Amino acid sequence: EVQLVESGGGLVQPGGSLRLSCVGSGRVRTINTAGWYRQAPGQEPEFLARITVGGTTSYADSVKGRFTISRDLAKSTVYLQMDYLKPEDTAVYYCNADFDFGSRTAWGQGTQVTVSS
Ligand SMILES: CCOP(=S)(OCC)Oc1ccc([N+](=O)[O-])cc1
């Protein structure tokens, strides 16, 4: 069993930046990949970025060149560095983790990001 807890987020101006954290607890060494997703108002959740234990990353086009995903294995924490922020980035941001040889999935609780002036 794996639990994910998110922190960071809140209100930021366009052009600002924020860092989100996704802290894993439990059997974290069984985690294979972790990803970030977001759910904008009125829309379904959308994939943003993924990272492997080895640190290989992959990104959706909507955030390529603006958001960065990273992980700290010792802290069992995956990060989303959200830069060059646009009003259209306003959403609830979720992290997930695939574990047990990619056969199970855990989700964080979500954190609101509001980009507004
Ligand atoms: C959401 C937390 O993910 P975290 S950093 O995984 C990112 C892919 O999980 C870990 C942590 C430590 C090890 N390890 O081998 O020591 C392996 C995986």
Give residue limits of the domains in the chain. Answer: 2-115
Q: Which fold has domain 2-115?
A: Immunoglobulin-like (2.60.40)
Bridge partner list, 7: 21
Q: DSSP secondary structure string, 12-81?
A: E-TT--EEEEEEEEESGGGEEEEEEEEE-TTS--EEEEEEETT--EEE-TTTTTTEEEEEETTTTEEEEE
- Please list every protein residue whose CB sits less than 6 Å from any atom of ligand 1: 4, 22, 24, 28-29, 31, 33-34, 51-53, 71, 73, 76-78, 97
The closest residue, in CA terms, to atom 4 on ligand 1 is: 76
The closest residue, in CA terms, to atom 14 on ligand 1 is: 29
Calpha distance 84→13 (Å, rounded): 10
Q: How many whole angstroms from 27 Cα to the centroid of ligand 1?
A: 9
Solving technique for this entry? Answer: X-ray
Q: Look up tokens 């960065």; give the residue.
A: 68
